Design a protein around this nucleic acid. Sequence first.
RNA 1: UAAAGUUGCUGCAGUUAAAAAGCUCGUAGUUGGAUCUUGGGAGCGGCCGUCCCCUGCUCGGCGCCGGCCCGAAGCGUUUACUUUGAAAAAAUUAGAGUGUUCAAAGCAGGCCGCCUGGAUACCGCAGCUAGGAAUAAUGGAAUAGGACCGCGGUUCUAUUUUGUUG
RNA 2: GGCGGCGACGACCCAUUCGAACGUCUGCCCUAUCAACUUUCGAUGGUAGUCGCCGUGCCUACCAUGGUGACCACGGGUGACGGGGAAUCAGGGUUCGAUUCCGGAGAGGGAGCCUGAGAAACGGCUACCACAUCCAAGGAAGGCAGCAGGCGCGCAAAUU
RNA 3: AAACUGCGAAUGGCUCAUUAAAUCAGUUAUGGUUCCUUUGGUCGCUCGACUUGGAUAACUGUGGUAAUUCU
Lengths: 141, 262, 143, 206, 64
Amino acid sequence: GKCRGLRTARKLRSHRRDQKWHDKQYKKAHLGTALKANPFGGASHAKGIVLEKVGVEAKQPNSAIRKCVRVQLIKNGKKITAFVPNDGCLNFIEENDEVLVAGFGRKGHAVGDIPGVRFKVVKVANVSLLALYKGKKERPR
Amino acid sequence: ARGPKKHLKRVAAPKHWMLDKLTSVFAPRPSTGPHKLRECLPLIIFLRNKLKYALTGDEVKKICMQRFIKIDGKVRADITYPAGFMDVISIDKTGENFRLIYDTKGRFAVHRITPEEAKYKLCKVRKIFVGTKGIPHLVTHDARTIRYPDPLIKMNDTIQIDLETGKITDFIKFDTGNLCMVTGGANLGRIGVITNRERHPGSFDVVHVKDANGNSFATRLSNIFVIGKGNKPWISLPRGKGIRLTIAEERDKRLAAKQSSG
Amino acid sequence: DIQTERAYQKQPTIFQNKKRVKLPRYYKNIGLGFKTPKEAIEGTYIDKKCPFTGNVSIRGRILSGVVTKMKMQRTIVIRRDYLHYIRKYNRFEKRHKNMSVHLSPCFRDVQIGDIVTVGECRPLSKTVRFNVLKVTKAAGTKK
Amino acid sequence: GISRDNWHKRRKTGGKRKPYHKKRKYELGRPAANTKIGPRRIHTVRVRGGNKKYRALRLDVGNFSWGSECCTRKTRIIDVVYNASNNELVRTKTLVKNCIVLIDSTPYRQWYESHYALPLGRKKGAKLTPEEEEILNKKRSKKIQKKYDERKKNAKISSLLEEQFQQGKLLACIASRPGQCGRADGYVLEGKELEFYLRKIKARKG
Amino acid sequence: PVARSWVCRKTYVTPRRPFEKSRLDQELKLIGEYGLRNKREVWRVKFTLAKIRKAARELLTLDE
RNA sequence: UAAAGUUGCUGCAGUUAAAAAGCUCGUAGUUGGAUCUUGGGAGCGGCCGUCCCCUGCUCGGCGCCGGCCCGAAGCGUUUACUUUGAAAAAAUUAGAGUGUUCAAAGCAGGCCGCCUGGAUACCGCAGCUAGGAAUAAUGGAAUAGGACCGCGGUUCUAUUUUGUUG
RNA sequence: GGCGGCGACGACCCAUUCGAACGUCUGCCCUAUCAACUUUCGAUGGUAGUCGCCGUGCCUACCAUGGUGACCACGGGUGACGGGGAAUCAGGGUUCGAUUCCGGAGAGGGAGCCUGAGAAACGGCUACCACAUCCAAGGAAGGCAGCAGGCGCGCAAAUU
RNA sequence: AAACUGCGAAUGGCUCAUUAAAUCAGUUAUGGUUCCUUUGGUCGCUCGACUUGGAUAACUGUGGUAAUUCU
């Protein structure tokens, strides 16, 4: 600290209180802007309906076409590019199918190659995309 | 709540009942009566937890409705009747008589008294009142409105009533050097001679009490009861004698008694 | 001099219309070793909310403060300064609670800055719960 | 209904309160009695604790006290003259505590004329024609006429009451709450009180 | 408002660094030597010691 | 949540990495120089260490020929600070005891009817209480309406007192 | 014919118990892109009433011009019921506490009242607003934020 | 059995919408109040019929409405 007075408790406290809004992590989690703006509306997961399948160009140096899905959510109706994770799993997704979407890892931030893609696809039509990939469950048809 | 509460939660029950955690959601809520909710011990808890004559609270209903239990000279048939300090429980068909005296810990203990001792009990007075035609009135710690008492009896004196008639026989006056059972706070169950009164206009008067091993301690005058003139008590005392051996000395005596016995 | 209200002002206890051939004044000791002043006994004022010559009993808390305003009639605003301990920043902060307190007109000579003792009682008004018991005059101010 | 609540209204600071609970029962107002002068109509009201409370709505008599020589009698209330609280509770003749009412004098005049045996009121010139209290002024024994004489020595009444007893109507101060207890009891104004309230009735008059 | 306990504690603590070669060495030594079945079994004996040890150090701050 | 001494009271930074107002004044806020009790009397242990002491004015008991020695209630700067005491629901946490077969738990149990347990600690601040008086605030007597002295007077007044009744 | 034991029930009032209510001191998160607010539809006082179980601008009438504020009033926000507590934690702290104990509040939204010691009760009543059920079309009945259970909502939660 | 009378139905349970000196916590007060119940008092304290009055419910019996814990 800088004021070491014995009666400086409101100066020391009110200063910290004021300067704590220059912390980015705090301001995010203590304003209503980051939460009202969040597509998931402050949830871990969210279900939405697949409307088209998109091929996103990898940022650069590594140049592949990442098979994401444009998803309209149920709760808000907001539109989301959600990455289909594992190898050749865009075959398991058709149009107008409910997908459970999760975050990618970096808490509302683009992860590696994929630009402007913050989310991944977990389940397709109440069947886990791992079980489809491994072939432990088959798609309900 | 928008009226009086009729249940007591097992957890919210006072600690000095020593009710377990796991048997029931509810504790026996003491019926209204002479003693306070958190200063009494219901008949049910005396009859099935302390003495274990019952197993359940339906057994205690069967015991008490045979009219075999007689608290301070009159038969009650309420399982949640508040039996409190200095009360005499006479279980007559067993031929037994119990006084509710505080052990060295804050609980009431199983203190067996002789049928002669069980005929009188000692009562701290709460206030002196002058009734509707110059009639002097006492009010004891167990709500006995005793009218035409001895004029020397003042508040914080104790009076020896005979159960059968409900009339005063003797009385200890609140003076220094008199024995004192502490009936409230951290010192609940201590016995010692009153060595000092410390007056506080408005606030609560505190009373220093020397013990039978020179262990002097203070107490709020509200939480004090005189049990004999000088050094001789007017009741029989439980083992420990309200002297309060420390936890180091308790460990020593418990360990000495276990190892020596076998 | 007095009795400027539409109703008649008098002490309720003392009776002043006994047949003849100076009115007697009710007072009391307040308790807690606080001396009833001379101006309460010898004076001619009439205040139902005086703790010496009124229908109010001092019980519970005795506090003090510094008289800061005297613009309300028969009542004053005192100011209680204290130090609240924030334990994070192992320090105090200066904090104050100003309370409206009734000022008995037996205390004729009271100036702002005088350290007044006050006694808890029944609520006299919406915001008043305290009567003045004694006034100790400010540091110096003998003139 | 009409509430007696401390929460509906601003703080010291002038900050409005948000109410946290709806109107409780015990936070109760009942409409004002506004009791009048007429044939005795008192309505019992149940209050908190199953206790009773008597709303007088009309009330024409009261147990008033003449405190000088400590006598009190049931006397007819005839007119409300002055109310210190509201000036418009005189026109609408509403009995409340600390009202200034005219009452009958004849119970006190009867007591005085029977206890002191001296003609009080009674405008000078006239006589008593029934000859009842004319005989109650005279015809005593030896030692009891001496008792009335020893009493008569210090039997002076004030010229203010002498005037009011002459008109047949005393000024009384209501001490009971007729809204609450259902009674219109009080005391008779004397000395500084009477001089004060006669000055206030005179100032209101013009 | 049920008449149950809910009171329960963990008996182990997972270590901060999950892949310390020297820790994996010494704990598998303890398991093989005293014939245990998992690392939780060493971690709980370590936690019983740390409780005893924490209690003992708390007493050493107090005067004789 | 820790890691984050990357919100910094402990405890961070601000020449050049992000950062000292263009400069000065200034009211709250915050922080404020030094200075006002010290040397001893007495004893124990082997010159040193712990211990006892540096205010007065109704009723009593170690008593003595109205006083002295002693105790009790009261009066005796204000706090802050510290130390003690009173008081503060349980459950939770710490923790005592106790082989639920171990353990988490539980509050039980243990002896060839009896013997026991159901402890104890902690419970920030604020309020109550009694030591201490360094440290920090604060007070006085400076046109002397200053003390402590005994005196001269005045006004109101418990009533102890004139065999009882003015 | 007179006189009597042991109870049950009821009862004015007092005390006691169970409380409840209104007050005392102290303590709460973010916000100044909220700095002045409160006040003749009470704001702070005084006097006298009304009402109330009582104390009090609680409410009248009449006076007074007060009351609160950079020591952060007033206004706004809260994914705010509060506390005991919980998670992490060397020492400090940070975060959480809808949740079994205590206290508070509400029964779809406001409002009003009956009875009673205790209610502004909703497994009481009366309206209005909202939604909705039987109907022979005249009417009648409703309140699962009780236990199950259904729909909806959802990432998210069990047996009519 | 039913019905009248008395008592209970104001506790318990559920939820967290409201609520930021409010609620709540420690702390006091009630000498400023109310209190069924319980406990103990009081219950020939007043100076003036060896048991009174007539309703109503269950019951019995006629019914009405599509319908109600309607009457």
